[PDB]
Design a protein around this nucleic acid. Sequence first.
RNA 1: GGGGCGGUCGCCUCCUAAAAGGUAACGGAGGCGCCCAAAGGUUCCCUCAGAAUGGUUGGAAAUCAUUCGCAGAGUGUAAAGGCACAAGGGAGCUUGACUGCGAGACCUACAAGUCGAGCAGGGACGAAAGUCGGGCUUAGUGAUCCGGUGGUUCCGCAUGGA
RNA 2: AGUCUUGGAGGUAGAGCACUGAUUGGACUAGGGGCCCCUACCGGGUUACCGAAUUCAGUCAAACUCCGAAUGCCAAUGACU
RNA 3: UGGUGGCGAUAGCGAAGAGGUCACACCCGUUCCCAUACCGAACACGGAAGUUAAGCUCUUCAGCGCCGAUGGUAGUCGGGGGUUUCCCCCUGUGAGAGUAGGACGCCGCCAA
RNA 4: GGUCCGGUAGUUCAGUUGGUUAGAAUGCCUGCCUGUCACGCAGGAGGUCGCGGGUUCGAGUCCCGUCCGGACCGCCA
Lengths: 82, 48, 135, 176, 120
Amino acid sequence: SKKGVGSTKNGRDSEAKRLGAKRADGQFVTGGSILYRQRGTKIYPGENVGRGGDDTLFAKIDGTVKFERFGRDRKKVSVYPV
Amino acid sequence: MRVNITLACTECGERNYISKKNKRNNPDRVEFKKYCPRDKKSTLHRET
Amino acid sequence: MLLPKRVKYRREHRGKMRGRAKGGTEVHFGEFGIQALEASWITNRQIEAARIAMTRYMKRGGKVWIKIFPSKPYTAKPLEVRMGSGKGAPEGWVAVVKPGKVLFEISGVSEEVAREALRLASHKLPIKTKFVKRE
Amino acid sequence: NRLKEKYNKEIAPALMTKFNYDSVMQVPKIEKIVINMGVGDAVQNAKAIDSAVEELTFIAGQKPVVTRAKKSIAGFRLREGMPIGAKVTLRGERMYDFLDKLISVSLPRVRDFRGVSKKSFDGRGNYTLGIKEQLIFPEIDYDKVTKVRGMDIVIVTTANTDEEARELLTQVGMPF
Amino acid sequence: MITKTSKNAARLKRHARVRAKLSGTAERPRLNVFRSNKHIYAQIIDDVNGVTLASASTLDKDLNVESTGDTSAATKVGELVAKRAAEKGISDVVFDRGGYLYHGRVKALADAAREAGLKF
RNA sequence: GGGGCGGUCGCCUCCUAAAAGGUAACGGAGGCGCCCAAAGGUUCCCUCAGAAUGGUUGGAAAUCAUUCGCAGAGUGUAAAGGCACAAGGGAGCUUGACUGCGAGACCUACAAGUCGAGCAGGGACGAAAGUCGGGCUUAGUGAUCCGGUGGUUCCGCAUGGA
RNA sequence: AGUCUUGGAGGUAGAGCACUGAUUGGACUAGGGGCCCCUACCGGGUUACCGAAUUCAGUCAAACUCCGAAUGCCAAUGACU
RNA sequence: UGGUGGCGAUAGCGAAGAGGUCACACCCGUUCCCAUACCGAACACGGAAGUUAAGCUCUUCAGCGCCGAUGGUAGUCGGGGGUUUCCCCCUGUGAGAGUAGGACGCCGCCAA
RNA sequence: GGUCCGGUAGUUCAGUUGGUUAGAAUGCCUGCCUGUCACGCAGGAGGUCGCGGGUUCGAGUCCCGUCCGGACCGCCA
């Protein structure tokens, strides 16, 4: 014999997006390249790096990338011209 | 409800801009001032 | 029969057990206590039976301390069903007990009677136990 | 004005000697006298606030502001956005001109009067009145009055404790 | 007493707010103003090295007036700081009100600097 | 976890997810098929929820006054990230909720999706700096074909028109 | 490409209560049962009989984290392979 | 003593105590610039009567907050066993809530 | 065991959708009528919405779970 069950109503989710840093500390970068595809201001932009409409960080001037602590807890990206 | 609308102008017939609007909040034929391309300057745009 | 009066979710992972207990490894409120030396689950029925076996025997001698709460629920699919197609309904509450945790503690009672009474209650639990006393 | 000159001349020296403040300007001072209006509207009668505003303007020296209710509450059916109450602040020469009317004519003109509330203080020199009638000065066009609701009145001082303010109000001229 | 916040304390928040957007780099320094009750100070500052270039004040050791704090003093000190920039000429600066409102003696100072020729 | 019946079919948030990213199940929890002529842009100015105490109509809460108060409150909405140097709240002006674009880069089987400094034409805001190519960031939406409507300095079967 | 060195993001194991919840005892009291009377209990006197709020101590969490590795991953520098 | 920057609060919060001729700040009154969705506290306005009371600036302190390796452990990379939902041995590696204590400020440049 | 319905005055049904109002007969109570009763005529009270939890300025009327019943399905070897 058999018995019936159903109504899980949980098998759904968003086709998840990619979030991470795709330039390494010390990597050379070119103007307009992406540094960190955050979602929300997880790490604020420093000099020469902008802040996109979707909270993204991009380098304005080609050079070398560097991460560094901002204040007590926060971080910040920067690009140091070579 | 929000309904699509296309913008029009008296300075020149050729107009292209589109927008959204609520009938309840703006029953009246709305006006905006925007840059027309073919007139190459800013003008006052009505809707159709 | 300790119900948690409310819970954030009624289903969650069974989890795993590793290492000694995080806290409450020794007697803290009573003269003497009982400790579990392996990891396992402990459920409402177990704590209730052990509590009664303690207090009903001990009568007016003193008070008994319980350091356990079955905040964790555990599920079980309905009887006679093909597995899968949704987690089963919850029907019991359980408390994780890693080794080293002291379960019950006694106060205001002579040593020997507490010893033998804890021995009596220990048979209610499914777990090898060791008698333990405050330093 | 009258009172104020008197405040400079007699009051401040007297209580400065009575409390021994090393610095003279540390002496307590009335900072503001503020009016609050409240109308059980939620709206009950839209004209109620639209009457209270321009009667309170006559009561005070200048126009009040309609108070914007903070959050909605269905207990009174008070939706957030329907105005209730009105406020007018007074200070400078105006506060003394107001206290003049109050102490001299208003309180003695109440339907009945005994010494004002004994312990209305907050704890840190502030002090409040609840007066039920609008009969504050006798030349209001008093026949106009439909609703009898009086005023909520708060006097705010630079006092840091209740005792000094209590003492000050005495020679300011408030009975108790 | 009633908790009255310091006027300078309130002003500092506005000054930090405005300073967040700009600052005076090399060959683009920043002007600054103090609008004290009794005096007016002006400063030309280079942020990155953290040092000033030239300054001016109502209580400068010459060209004094009985004003020493009014709009006339603001105009005079403005043209003074313009010269103080002139000798080690910079010719351009980023204006930065000291968390003030651009209506009064600050406007007088700005007008003086502009007419003297410090191109904002 | 044989079929039938039940349930589901696209998109968005989190956990499962094993400290990069990615990662399934008829696994565990929610939401979307919009809304906003201001809830946009810009300049300027502040600051919360709750609590205690006095105050009437009026209490547990209406509206006041003091004090405490790192965020408990808010952020159009569902979760997360992040926000009191505002991204939260208020006022004036305004329509960049622009056109032509776009060095580079992310994401990717393909189709698509995303960010983007910088240039030119004209603006809006502000004295200026300088900001503005829609919402505080992520959902609020679909191929091609065919047809409708507007502009066309394009072609239009001998030529001129259609 | 591997390894050595340097620098990065990353919040798991672990640990913990600083937040969100769960949660055990002591102290304490607001407020409730507690009958008597005066009586509309006005209030007193009222059991630890319950009992919110705080503070001392204590135990938990995939959708809690003030913390946080080992590894893995992304690069730079040079050195050997 | 003022102004204005950088530094992780080792800078904060508290508790006490000192200062002001000059500097600063409270103060004085809205006459005209400007403003109070009501107001000269606030915005600006033009002085200088009196006051260090507060702000601000200095002296002191471990009550709170903050910072903080040493040896332990728990965990764990890589090997090896065991009666194996889980335990144990070896090369490293190294938790944090705990104390050793640091700290109730350090660097500037223009005006005294 | 699954899917779908509902649960309201003492009884029976609207409202239950209109998030912002609890209603209609019967019953019951008082009076009148009749010698008395019954019809009949005047008047009047009631539930505050199965239970628990949650969104919201506001839940009966929205969303969840629990109890209650009622409708349908539970098939192929």
